[PDB]
Amino acid sequence: PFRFSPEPTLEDIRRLHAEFAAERDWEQFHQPRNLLLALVGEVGELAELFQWKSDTEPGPQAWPPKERAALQEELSDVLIYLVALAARCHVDLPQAVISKMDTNRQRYP
């Protein structure tokens, strides 16, 4: 029964990223719209994976090796830029998610 690993946490990821950016072009990574565009480009790359996928053909779990690899990568980079963006925005992403999930229960009855 599929589950995620217990770690890294969102916090752990936030620290891996903060370090990664700290030792690099920290100001390129500091600009919220930069992170947001990077996040957009990553969501786009993700869409390129799926764009010609019939909803009738083998789903992502049955994708061949090169495609699963690229998919894991793209999903990961979406996540990395989202936490970097959340962190830059001083948004406490894990808590805001509880808050938002509660909102979505009345949005989707």
Place this chain on the structure above:
Amino acid sequence: PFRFSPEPTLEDIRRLHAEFAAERDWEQFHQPRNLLLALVGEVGELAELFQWKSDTEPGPQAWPPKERAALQEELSDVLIYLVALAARCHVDLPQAVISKMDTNRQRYPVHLS
């Protein structure tokens, strides 16, 4: 030094959402491309928050409360859909991030003296 809370974890979120999805229309929430498009729509909502923002005017932390509230929500929704997509695809997202961080670390070497 802004920090995220220790929880929920990515796994707690996956689990919470699977419960959320299970009480709703099945494959409204289980079709991968539905989830992908919801993710996309949600990243576009975020884009709309930022569209007219000077890189020169007060940044997101200093935005008005309504805009901050919206920003928290969109970011959260991006994450939820991403998590749901990753889960639907049987991608162990937290582990896949580490492998990605390492690839990134190798594609983007640090500069020394």
